[PDB]
Structures are given as structure tokens and as C-alpha cells.
Ligand SMILES: CC(=O)N[C@@H]1[C@@H](O[C@@H]2OC(C(=O)O)=C[C@H](O)[C@H]2O)[C@@H](O)[C@@H](COS(=O)(=O)O)O[C@H]1O
């Protein structure tokens with residue numbers, strides 16, 4: 001009756017193996033997954049950390065933080081995969097032969113492969129988030145598109161104060177985000193100010209975003225915008241339904257979010273909110289700086305086979321199934337005759353995905369059947385092109401043609417001892433950044449008074465050492 005245990009979460013949800021996509025993989029592979037993440041869990045980091053203190057690791061370990069996952073491999077919790085691939089995973093073997101660049105994302109410094117990344121279709125679509133504004137609200141209030149951060153401030157104030165949704169209530173939420181943890185909340189707020197909450201490249205050197213003066217300015221500005229009601233008062237708690245809720249109730253004025261799914265709302269709300277026009281704009285300029293650091297990475301997270309799995313050969317065959325023509329189509333597009341049909345050998349989505357009766361993104365519908373569930377699969381840009389609006393496709397080209405996107409820093413790989421030390425310092429600093437950034441934005445601490453002590457705290461945790469490690473690995 002053999003069960004396969006897994007730890008898998010994504011976007012705050014424990015994987016449900018009864019979703020249509022995984023029922024089909026179960027039928028095709030004979031693998032019956034049982035999640036050791038339970039259905040009430042939503043914090044993937046605390047769940048993972050807790051799972052490690054179990055007795056046994058589950059057979060398959062999926063995690064979004066790939067440096068942590070690779071450290072589990074280095075420590076022996078995840079087994080090397082390269083011989084299992086070479087002998088039992090022909091689709092993966094072919095994928096790695098055909099894509100050496102992607103193969104290097106998977107190979108650790110000691111030469112073993114401890115995880116299959118979940119790859120984006122990066123050499124086809126490299127942009128990710130873009131800035132959007134309610135063009136219909138600008139028009140109703142007689143305003144031009146703001147082009148700098150200060151004009152955006154004035155525009156958001158006017159959205160807040162001048163009832164652009166026309167209902168006689170002071171209900172507007174001028175700028176909002178969509179995220180399921182603090183780092184991703186900060187990701188969609190500090191880039192406005194040319195800052196970053198993570199590591200980034202500056203002229204061949206690697207630097208920590210939160211330790212920079214542009215991060216202090218971003219936070220101090222956000223704190224002032226928060227006090228004046230220009231950014232959602234619930235930025236940190238609203239969760240992943242923020243965008244659906246704020247847009248569909250005609251409260252949200254502007255955001256920074258993934259281009260294809262944010263572009264889906266014009267069609268989706270066309271009847272419910274006449275004239276709704278949430279429109280992509282180039283990143284607002286800050287003293288002539290036109291750049292954004294929103295770019296797709298080559299992969300996100302991954303999964304590996306634990307040292308405690310009884311049957312690693314049947315598990316590597318499961319990993320491989322997702323790389324056949326059919327398994328990769330299943331993962332990306334969902335079920336034939338439900339989410340898509342074949343027209344000339346190629347999938348065309350149905351109205352269930354493209355014209356959801358209740359206002360759902362096409363991507364939201366696809367995720368409800370288990371498509372696009374981050375594990376260790378290979379995204380296919382044709383799935384995204386199959387539901388992306390014409391304004392989404394023009395949007396990608398808009399950001400590329402204007403050269404506003406700075407490439408993401410690769411996630412770097414380190415030797416055994418440095419890798420353990422880097423992830424330890426990086427995680428401890430991340431906690432400090434998220435604690436202080438919240439207090440400063442929410443108004444319970446004063447950034448001007450506390451910034452220097454905050455810097456000393458990061459330094460005392462090891463900022464210099466992590467920085468040295470990042471620059472050796474670069
Ligand atoms: C690999 C994965 O599931 N990535 C998640 C992102 O998914 C992308 O979303 C879109 C889109 O237009 O929304 C297009 C891509 O095809 C799809 O991979 C996305 O859901 C983000 C949202 O995170 S957040 O912005 O920080 O909330 O989450 C990634 O995990």
C-alpha cells in the first residue's frame with residue numbers, strides 16, 4: 001500500500017496530494033504522497049525548521065530556501081542524486097545535458113547534486129514584478145502619470161484624500177502589496193526607493209541591502225507614508241488575498257507585483273468596476289535612477305531525497321516524471337479536458353482558466369488544481385503566454401525595451417563550513433531586519449535614533465564575515 005512521505009508547502013499551503021495534478025501523477029507513477037506538513041500549517045520556514053527536529057526526515061524534502069536545502073545535503077540529510085539520475089532519470093539527464101547553465105544551479109561545491117531546483121523558464125521570460133497604477137483614477141482626478149517617487153507620493157495622497165472611487169467614503173488604499181511573509185512585503189515596498197531587503201551586486205562586489213543608506217531612506221519614507229494612510233495599514237498582515245480583495249472592492253490604487261497576473265485584473269473586473277484600468281508603468285525615477293531590482297531568478301527552491309527514504313530509486317523516477325513532455329505539461333497546464341485542450345498538439349486553456357466566473361486570476365485557477373506547485377519542476381513559458389493578456393505581453397517587452405531591470409544576484413554556493421556559517425549569519429540578520437523594519441514602518445521605533453545600533457547589531461551577528469563569504473563565492 002506503500003506511502004511516500006513528503007514535506008511540501010508553497011504559498012502558505014501544505015501540498016494536498018488529492019488535487020487533480022497529483023492524482024494524475026499518482027496514477028502514472030504509483031507514488032502516493034503523504035505530507036508531513038499538516039493542513040493547518042502556513043509558515044513554511046517554521047514548519048521546515050520544526051520538521052528537522054523530527055526523528056526521521058520524510059522521504060522527499062521540498063523547501064523554498066535553497067541555500068538551506070543544500071546545507072541539508074552537505075550535512076548528509078539529503079543524498080547525492082547524480083548516480084540515481086544517470087541510471088534512472090533519463091528526462092533529467094537529458095535536461096541537464098541540454099542546459100549546462102541550469103545544471104550548475106543544481107551542482108553543489110563538492111560536486112554532488114543534492115536537490116532538483118524548481119526552474120523558471122528564465123531564458124524565455126526574465127521579468128517578474130512591475131509597477132501598476134489605477135489609470136482610471138488618475139483620469140477621474142485629472143492627474144498625469146507620476147514619474148518620480150515624490151510625484152508618486154503626491155498622487156497617492158490625492159487617491160487617499162479625494163475619493164477617486166466616487167463613493168463618498170474615505171476608503172481608498174492608495175498603494176498595496178501582495179505577499180505571504182515580511183521579506184516579501186518589504187520586497188514590494190523598498191524597491192520603490194531603489195533599496196533591497198537581500199544581497200545584491202555592485203560593480204562585481206556583493207553587498208547586503210538592509211545595511212545600506214538607501215534602505216534607511218526607504219524605511220523612513222514608508223513610515224511617513226504609512227502614517228498618512230498612503231500604504232495599506234494592513235501591509236504586513238493582509239496576506240495573499242490582498243490584491244484580490246483590494247482590487248475587487250475598488251479600494252486599491254497602485255501596487256508593485258508580478259506582471260502577468262496583475263495585468264489579468266482589467267479583464268477580470270471589467271464589468272464589476274466600469275472603466276477599471278490598472279496599468280503598468282516604468283519604475284518611478286529616484287533622482288534619475290530608473291532601475292528596478294525585480295527580476296526572475298533562474299530557479300526558486302527545490303526538492304531532494306532524504307537519507308531516511310527506504311526506496312530512493314522509485315523517488316528519483318518520481319522526480320523524473322515531471323521532466324517528460326507529458327509530466328512537464330501536467331505540472332504547467334493542469335488536466336487535459338479540464339484546464340486545457342490540445343489544438344494542433346499544443347495546449348489552449350479553457351474558459352475555466354481564462355474567464356473564471358468569480359474573478360480569479362487564470363494563475364489562481366491553475367494553482368487550485370495543483371498546477372504550478374513549486375517543487376523541483378521546470379516551468380514552461382508557454383503556459384504563462386497561454387493566459388497572459390496582450391497588455392501583459394506588451395508589458396514584458398516594455399520593461400525589456402527600456403532596460404529598467406537589473407538582473408538578480410545568483411544564489412551563491414559555498415564549501416561545507418562556510419555554507420553552514422553563511423546561512424546561520426544570513427538567517428540571524430534577516431530576523432533583525434524584519435523586526436526593525438516593521439517597528440520603524442509601524443511607528444513603534446524611531447529609525448533615526450536606532451539605525452546605528454541596528455547596524456552594530458548586524459555587524460556583531462557576522463555581517464563582515466557573511467560579506468567575505470559572498471564575495472569569495474562570487
Ligand atoms: C515558482 C512559483 O510558484 N513562483 C511564485 C510566483 O509565481 C509566478 O507568478 C506569476 C504571476 O504573474 O503572478 C507568473 C509566473 O509564471 C509564476 O511562476 C508568484 O506567485 C510569487 C508571488 O509571491 S510574492 O510576489 O512574493 O507573493 O510567489 C512565487 O513563489
Ligand SMILES: [Ca+2]
Pocket residue numbers: 163164165166167168169170171172
Ligand atoms: Ca472612496
